[PDB]
């Protein structure tokens, strides 16, 4: 009913977009002050990697349950409860005594639990208020808040820490705006209507689809590399710059760089695939594979330039991020091309789960574990801390090359999978 939509849809879209910005502003505030967290709690590289692994595991487990409860109960109540759920906990976790490291890990788990609800439920509301023509534009406006919040995380954390003089203050700002958004959503968002079944046949059919499996494994590789680098880059840059005796501007510059690479990579990928589709019908997997194999080379050069000059490292980071973030708007098309319309709702929900299981659930912890394992076998000094983190961070190009190989294997079966899908659909109806 447009009669109330004339105000409700605009107000809801704006407030939910700001909610998404606040949602992503609180995942990367800890990555900005990881060095201070380590120096205060007195821990090592093994335990400083749990603070993102626990978050990701909790998000993994708690997303499908909220995705199910979102179509039995009132959605505004759940969104409001989650908002404060992830807010109040974030605020309360800044008073922890020095002897209680594990309590911070528990806090991060609870924050992840709340963010799962928000990020699973909000798109459904923002997509049930609009018709066939303007749903896509509003969804894009919702989605184009990931890079902005991601950069604002580093920038806010570093700036507040430097200005206040105590790292605790980095965790005491976003709850104030969360407590406002969680009240404004109760006012500006109109109520939206809600809504033996077997999903074993869906699984049994999806397992024998080679393109689907290979694309899922490639997405897992992308998640691995993205999580590891996004958590462990700024600390490595700081250590390297300390080694040269030429030095928190690193977080500022990294946030500024990612805020632009996020848009640039997606635009480049979309243009390239639109050009390529008119030459051959294997365009999407080949474009993705070329992107991965061209991003691995520029990723691998950070660890060589960082020993001699910093500006080269920044340029390599720019190019690597730009090429790596050029296959986030293509994989959904590969999924839609070879999966019949009745099995898509399952085939997405499964894939996301897998993308978190083989990907960024255990990657930062693995990097920290390998770093300490290498570190304990040699002398203790800043130079070996730098070289240890550098040598640990070399597993990412290997995984990226594996992802490229999987995209090629997808391009190998793309056409046969399409033909089978068409025969299935025309036999159903």
């Amino acid at each position: 009913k447009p009669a109330s939509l004339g105000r409700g849809r605009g107000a809801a879209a704006a407030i939910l977009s700001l909610g998404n910005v606040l949602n992503y502003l609180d995942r990367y505030t800890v990555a900005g002050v990881l060095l201070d967290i380590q120096q205060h709690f007195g821990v090592k590289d093994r335990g400083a990697g749990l603070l993102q692994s626990v978050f990701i595991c909790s998000f993994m487990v708690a997303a499908p349950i909220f995705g199910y409860l979102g179509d039995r109960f009132n959605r505004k109540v759940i969104l409001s409860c989650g908002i404060f759920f992830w807010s109040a906990v974030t605020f309360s976790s800044s008073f922890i005594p020095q002897q209680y490291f594990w309590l911070l890990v528990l806090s991060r788990g609870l924050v992840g639990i709340g963010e799962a609800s928000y990020s699973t439920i909000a798109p459904t509301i923002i997509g049930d208020l609009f018709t066939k023509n303007t749903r896509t534009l509003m969804l894009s406006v919702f989605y184009f808040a990931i890079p902005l919040g991601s950069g604002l995380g580093y920038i806010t954390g570093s700036s507040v820490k430097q200005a206040a003089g105590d790292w605790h203050w980095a965790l005491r700002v976003s709850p104030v705006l969360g407590m406002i958004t969680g009240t404004l959503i109760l006012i500006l968002v109109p109520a939206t209507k809600r809504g033996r079944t077997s999903w074993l046949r869906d699984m049994k059919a999806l397992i024998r689809n080679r393109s689907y499996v290979f694309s899922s494994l490639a997405t897992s590789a992308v998640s691995f590399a993205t999580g590891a680098l996004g958590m462990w880059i700024p600390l490595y840059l700081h250590r390297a710059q300390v080694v040269q005796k030429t030095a928190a501007k690193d977080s500022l510059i990294f946030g500024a760089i990612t805020c632009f690479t996020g848009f640039l990579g997606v635009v480049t990928g979309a243009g390239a695939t639109r050009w390529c589709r008119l030459k051959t019908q294997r365009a999407d997997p080949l474009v993705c594979a070329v992107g991965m194999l061209g991003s691995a080379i520029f990723i691998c050069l950070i660890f060589v330039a960082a020993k001699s000059s910093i500006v080269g490292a920044y340029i390599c980071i720019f190019v690597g991020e730009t090429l790596l973030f050029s296959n986030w708007a293509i994989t959904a098309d590969i999924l839609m091309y070879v999966v019949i319309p009745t099995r898509r709702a399952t085939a997405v929900a499964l894939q996301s789960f897998t993308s978190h299981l083989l990907g960024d659930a255990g990657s930062p912890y693995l990097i920290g574990f390998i770093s300490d394992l290498i570190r304990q076998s040699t002398k203790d000094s800043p130079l070996w801390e730098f070289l240890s983190l550098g040598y640990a961070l070399m597993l990412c190009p290997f995984v990226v090359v594996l992802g490229g190989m999987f995209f090629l294997a997808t391009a190998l079966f793309f056409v046969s999978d399409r033909a089978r899908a068409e025969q299935q659909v025309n036999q159903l109806a």
Partner: nanobody
Amino acid sequence: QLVESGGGLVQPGGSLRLSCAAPGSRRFDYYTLGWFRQAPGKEREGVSCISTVGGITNYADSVKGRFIISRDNAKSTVYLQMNSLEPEDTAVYYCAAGREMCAPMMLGDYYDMDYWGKGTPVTVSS
């Protein structure tokens, strides 16, 4: 864009053969077929479509048994063969290029085609 051809003035009981072609070196293998039509006092509706790989055809309910669509990939052309025309077939006919699988109950939706033509009028006399 795509370029249409054919169409004219036909008497009742006649036949006519329309064609769409791609310009330049574009190939349009990924997917580019489906014929639509529009009348002076009605809305745009779908008439037929064919599939990318196997050659599977679907027609609307009111044209079954009369029209026949075909695809030729060596020349990048699509043909429609129209038989036993009636005074209710006066309209302007279009080609389109989209991405959704060829199936029934997919025809009538035309908000998700990527490429459109300009149309060629067909007038059935009396």
